[PDB]
Copies of this chain bind each other. A is one copy, B any other.
Amino acid sequence: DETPASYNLAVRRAAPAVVNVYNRGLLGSGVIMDQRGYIITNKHVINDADQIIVALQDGRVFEALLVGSDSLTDLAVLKINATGGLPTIPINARRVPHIGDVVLAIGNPYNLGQTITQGIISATGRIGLNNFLATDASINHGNSGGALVNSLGELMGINTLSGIGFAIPFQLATKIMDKLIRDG
């Protein structure tokens, strides 16, 4: 008949880029950022990791290398052997997230698998030492280190644990990722 109001479009372009992270010693989410095979995630996920294992929604499974992390922003960067065509998380550094914007929270809890929740940008600004993004989309261990995107699928932030949920603005998460790629 007609067309149901839906944010499925955003799911198809963003969700395949979000990933499951495992420990395989003798669990959380992550986000493929670029073709080079760099993935963002959370420290509390990969701490004391023995072997890091990444699993995509297309069925591919890799062993990840821990590039570097940042206790301050709780973020961590992994590195997998990028092969032929990787799903990457849509990014627009020219986009200015506005408060009230619709956002989808994407994460693959070890229980249910990939789960999309819906809310809006509740607030932004600074609250710490040196920048956060608040949202009423459910944000727990199940989707921590996951993506947070607008109705267009553009990456707004990386779900974090710093009725209200938090994310790290994609603009900051980028900078942090880039610096962690440093190799003194």
**Residues of A near any B CB (own CB < 8 A):** 1-11, 15, 92, 95, 98-102, 104, 112-123, 125, 127, 134, 136-138, 140, 150-152, 154, 163-164
A134-B112 contact in complex given A6-B100, A98-B6, C-beta closer than 8 Å: yes
Contact B102–A164 (Cβ < 8 Å): no
| A101 proximity list for chain B (CB < 8 A) | 4-8
Choose one: B5, B10, B112; the contact of A151 (CB below 8 Å): B5
Contact A100–B10 (Cβ < 8 Å): yes
Choose one: B95, B99, B125, B164; the contact of A8 (CB below 8 Å): B99
Contact A123–B118 (Cβ < 8 Å): no
Copies of the chain in the assembly: 3
Contact A1–B114 (Cβ < 8 Å): no
What would be 27 A-B contacts, judged by CB atoms less than 8 Å apart?
A2-B152, A4-B95, A4-B101, A4-B102, A4-B151, A7-B100, A7-B120, A8-B98, A8-B100, A8-B101, A9-B100, A99-B116, A100-B118, A104-B120, A112-B123, A112-B134, A113-B125, A115-B123, A116-B120, A116-B121, A116-B122, A117-B119, A117-B163, A118-B120, A118-B136, A136-B138, A138-B164
| A127 proximity list for chain B (CB < 8 A) | 112
| A10 proximity list for chain B (CB < 8 A) | 100
In the bound assembly, the distance between CA atoms of A6 and B92 in angstroms comes to: 17
Give 15 new A-B contacts, CB below 8 A, not counting A10-B100, A118-B120.
A3-B152, A5-B102, A8-B98, A100-B116, A104-B120, A112-B134, A113-B123, A114-B123, A115-B123, A115-B134, A115-B164, A117-B120, A117-B163, A117-B164, A138-B163
In the bound assembly, the distance between CA atoms of A77 and B100 in angstroms comes to: 28
